[PDB]
């Protein structure tokens, strides 16, 4: 169940909001963690083809460049059961951590896609930190882009859960983590989304992406 | 824009929600 290639493992990923240094007191929208357990191992790109970019540099081309073991699909059920966004003065962020056996400089590109078309991209570079015999990489508290903050505002205030799911059917994120020096794909993660019911927290299911 | 996304996804329903 690890999002791990031969060269890189994403151990943790969370997106959250909190009061601007009012905390502990955060709310997680989505969360993958070693701290948090979770429970069909592959999905073919044909199932998600139109939900991601597919031109030069697109998902299919990236997959064909490989390596095949670097490509994953994560389905998230996002927990929007919070009122912090309505109070204002909130901080919205994303934190991730990775590990490798190798010392690398990595670049994480995150593309937000609407109906399969990129609308915003964030690029972050991180450096290896040796700890207890392996290399750790952290992207800590990266602020969510304004597009996504506004999207969450508008989404959480629709009148029906099913409408939230409809909006989310054509909202995706494509994360590509590359080795900065070689441009090798270390990890490529396609994210698709639904909302959690009010009585449930965030959930996820992880798949390997394949292409028959 | 976020508004354009919502209008594409929800059709006339979003037009009604946004207006009123």
Please give the residue range of the domain that contains residue A132: 1-212
**Is B15 in CB contact (< 8 Å) with chain A?**
no
Query: Can you say whether the dihedral through the CA atoms of A194, A117, A73, A133 is positive or negative?
Result: negative
Q: What is the 3-state secondary structure (H, E, C) of chain A?
A: CCEECCCCEEEEEEEEEEECCCCCCCEEEEEEECCECCCCCEEEHHHCHHHCCCCCCCHHHHHHHCCHHHEEEEEEEECCCCCHHHHCCEEEEEEEEEEECCCCEEEEEEEEEECCEEEEEEEEEEECEEECCEEEEEEEEEECCHHHHHHHHHHHCCCCHHHHHHHHHCEEEEEEEEECCCCCEEEEEEEEEEECCCCCCCEEEEEEEECC
Token pair belonging to A202? 């965030």
Cα angle for residues B14, A82, A195 (degrees, 5° grid): 55
What is the C-alpha separation between A101 and A206, in angstroms, rounded? 23
**Is A167 in CB contact (< 8 Å) with chain B?**
yes
Cα angle for residues A68, A169, B6 (degrees, 5° grid): 135
What is the C-alpha separation between A107 and A10, in angstroms, rounded? 13
What is the C-alpha separation between A123 and A141, in angstroms, rounded? 14
- Residue A56's Cβ-count burial label (10 Å; 0-12, 13-18, 19+) is exposed
Instruction: Look at B10 and A163 and tell me if their CB atoms are within 8 Å.
Output: yes
Q: Please report, for residues A75, A97, A137, the alpha-carbon distance to residue A118 in angstroms, rounded to integers and kept in the order given.
A: 19, 24, 26
Kindly report the nearest CA distance between residue B19 and chain A, in angstroms: 13
Chain B residue at shortest CA distance from A150: B2
What is the residue whose two structure tokens read 């073991």? A69
What is the C-alpha separation between A183 and A119, in angstroms, rounded? 23
Chain B residue at shortest CA distance from A145: B2
B9: phi then psi, degrees, rounded to nearest 5: -70, -45
Looking at residue B15, what DSSP letter applies? H
Token pair belonging to A186? 């270390």
Q: Resolution of the deposited coordinates, in angstroms?
A: 1.3
**Is B7 in CB contact (< 8 Å) with chain A?**
no
Instruction: Look at B5 and A151 and tell me if their CB atoms are within 8 Å.
Output: yes
Chain B residue at shortest CA distance from A119: B1
Q: Of the candidates B2, B6, B10, which has its C-beta nearest A147's C-beta?
A: B2
Q: Interhelix angle for B2-10 vs B12-19, to 10°?
A: 130
What is the residue whose two structure tokens read 């798949």? A207
What is the C-alpha separation between A85 and A72, in angstroms, rounded? 30
State the total domains in chain A: 1
């Amino acid at each position: 169940r690890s999002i791990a290639s031969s060269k890189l493992w994403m151990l943790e990923f969370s997106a959250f909001l909190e009061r601007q240094q009012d905390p502990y007191n955060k709310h997680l929208f989505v969360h993958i963690s070693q701290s948090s357990p979770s429970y069909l191992e592959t999905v073919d790109i044909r199932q998600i083809y139109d939900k991601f970019p597919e031109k030069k540099g697109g998902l299919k081309e990236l997959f064909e460049r490989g390596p095949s073991n670097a490509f994953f699909l994560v389905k998230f059920w996002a927990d929007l059961n919070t009122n912090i966004d309505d109070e204002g003065s909130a901080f919205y962020g994303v934190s991730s951590q990775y590990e490798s056996p190798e010392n690398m400089i990595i670049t994480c590109s995150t593309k937000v896609c609407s109906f399969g078309k990129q609308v915003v991209e964030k690029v972050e570079t991180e450096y290896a930190r040796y700890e207890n015999g392996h290399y750790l990489y952290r992207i800590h508290r990266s602020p969510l882009c304004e597009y996504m903050i506004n999207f969450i505002h508008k989404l959480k205030h629709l009148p029906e859960k099913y409408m939230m799911n409809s909006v989310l059917e054509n909202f995706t994120i494509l994360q590509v983590v590359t080795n900065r020096d070689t441009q090798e794909t270390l990890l490529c993660i396609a994210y698709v989304f639904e909302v959690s019911a009010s009585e449930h927290g965030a959930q996820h299911h992880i798949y390997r992406l394949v292409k028959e | 824009s976020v508004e354009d996304h919502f209008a594409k996804a929800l059709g006339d329903t979003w037009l009604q929600i946004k207006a009123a």
